[PDB]
Known about the structure:
It catalyses: RNA(n) + a ribonucleoside 5'-triphosphate = RNA(n+1) + diphosphate. Helices cover about 40% and strands about 15% of the residues. By secondary structure, the protein is α+β, with helices and mostly antiparallel strands.
Amino acid sequence: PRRAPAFPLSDIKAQMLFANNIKAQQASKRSFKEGAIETYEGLLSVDPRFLSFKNELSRYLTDHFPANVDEYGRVYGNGVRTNFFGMRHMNGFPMIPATWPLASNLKKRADADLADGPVSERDNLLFRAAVRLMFSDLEPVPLKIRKGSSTCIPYFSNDMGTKIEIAERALEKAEEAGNLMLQGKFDDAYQLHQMGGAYYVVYRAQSTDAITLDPKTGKFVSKDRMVADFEYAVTGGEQGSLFAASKDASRLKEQYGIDVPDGFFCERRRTAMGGPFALNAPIMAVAQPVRNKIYSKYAYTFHHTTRLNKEEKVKEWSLCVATDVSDHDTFWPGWLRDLICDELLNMGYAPWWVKLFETSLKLPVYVGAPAPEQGHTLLGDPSNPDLEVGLSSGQGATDLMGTLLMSITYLVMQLDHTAPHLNSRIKDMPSACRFLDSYWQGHEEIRQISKSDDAMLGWTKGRALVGGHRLFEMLKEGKVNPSPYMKISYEHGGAFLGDILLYDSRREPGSAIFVGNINSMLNNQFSPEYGVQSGVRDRSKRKRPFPGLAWASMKDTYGACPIYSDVLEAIERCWWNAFGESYRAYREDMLKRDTLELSRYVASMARQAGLAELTPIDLEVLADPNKLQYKWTEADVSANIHEVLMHGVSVEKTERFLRSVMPR
DNA sequence: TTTCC
Ligand SMILES: [Mn+2]
């Protein structure tokens, strides 16, 4: 059923993905690599003291604080929704092998019994309306760029200077490129303006994954993670095989002499895509304005910030269903891409720009090194972009594509199983838009709060409410999938955007509260995803610019947690047993050091002015800029701090670009 | 020597 074309790094199609410079060449050839991360300055993730500390803390907490989740995934009691064995990973060493990314998800989707298009005319309107509401009256802003990010194919540059030129250039030739694409000359477009080529696969760590302790054997069990070998990936499942990767960390002893204590495993690795910046720029240019619109006008269902922010909305519900999507990104439907593009043209978006946007969602992928002696292969032909990988992370609007898909999907689940009486309100585009715009503002008897694949569905007192309960029940029994679009189910440990919904005996949205997930504190602090990169002079360019800072926001972030106090003590204690030092003290030092280093990067901070003027968010973001790509937005961060992490292109240059893209 | 609000 069309095996994807594949080329070796030596084939000219691959070669042309990397420019004639060291950086690029090196990325094309980068071989499999692993090794312990510098968890904190001077501390190796596999250091024996640490591993012991981890073994004792994890064992203890699990024992003394077992999960408090009811038959309905609602979490009550201690706020603990699972054991603490997730920290038992030798951070820095991946499971082998990683997965080859699947070239086409058509068969995957079909075998999962999910639709290949809007299933009913209503749905077709709803999705299309989502596009109309989202892409309509956008306000130009400057194109922000993450500092130290790679431009990937073809240059692989990190120099902000270069990135800016690259972007400004793209905005200037995007139009000419898109047209070249409309004429079917992708090679021309790639060669002339670097808009095309392929995504660069970078494997990322999932520092914590499930691990359980079989009471019978007294042995631990790492959650298996299925992976696709090359054959499977190119044949969309037809041939090849799918199997569990090996998380066994015994090899570490034999290979690096690293002592592996019982019950520790290699990390789970997820694929990630590095988009060719020349192409992603013009897209990001439009993407941010969209974020601004939906986060403002549709702030009810789309703009989420504090534990209290969310709590306010949910408290007024009579029923709150916390859903869960399976493998969101690889399931995302190419038809939604096409539908969106088509509707965009109807709204009146420059063809060339829509063509760029489309192409960006069907681009080939260059697999680096999923395992030793593997990779260096390009999937799909750049001359004629026709892949169906689902959502590709490095794409300029991945979050938007996911939200658009899922938000309408949940609204449909509600309509289908609990609110048929609302169907009559959706007769055509206008009536559809009207309905959706009211729905998104939280003004209907059915509601949702969401971001990509996380969401909470609500029902107020009313006609749909009885249906709501029925649906939730369909979900508990979980024998039938409530949607025709994605595989939905309820989240075992109902939580939204990092905060857990803590129900009391009543088990109701009004008497429930939002506490931080205590586990996430543990994961952030003892299982980071990247080391401290002390070798990188520019902390603003590091994955973890100022680690110590997160101590400051800790109380604010997780304090509301029921077992907070206990865990901090459990830690301090186990840390004493393992290092003969006070963990609190350790972090207070890191806090002081980092707070001082920070002022060097904040123009407005006196050369020793405290953390006075900074929000908890500011801190969590500075400690982990990644939270900016999944939890918060430029708007939730103090301006002077956002500047530290991002740098932008002139509003003039972008505003002019946008003006030629948008319809009105 | 490696992505995206
Ligand atoms: Mn959730």
